[PDB]
């Protein structure tokens, strides 16, 4: 099943391809091969986000 994380902090994209989100958002983790920047999806957008802004759900 898909892995989900939940946002601990609001994140405003600064570069192309980054995924924005607000606290409480559930993000589907699509790629966690890098220890710092993961690829995720939320509400129909996908993009890279900082792992230190989220916490594990499942």
């Amino acid at each position: 099943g898909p892995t989900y994380v939940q946002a601990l902090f609001d994140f405003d994209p600064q570069e192309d391809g980054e995924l924005g989100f607000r606290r409480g958002d559930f993000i589907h983790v699509m790629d966690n091969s890098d220890p710092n920047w993961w690829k995720g999806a939320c509400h129909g957008q996908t993009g890279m986000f900082p792992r230190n802004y989220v916490t594990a759900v499942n």
Partner: peptide, 9 residues
């Protein structure tokens, strides 16, 4: 303040 953006690889 929110945490610093980590290094891009």
């Amino acid at each position: 303040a929110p945490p610093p953006r980590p290094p891009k690889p």
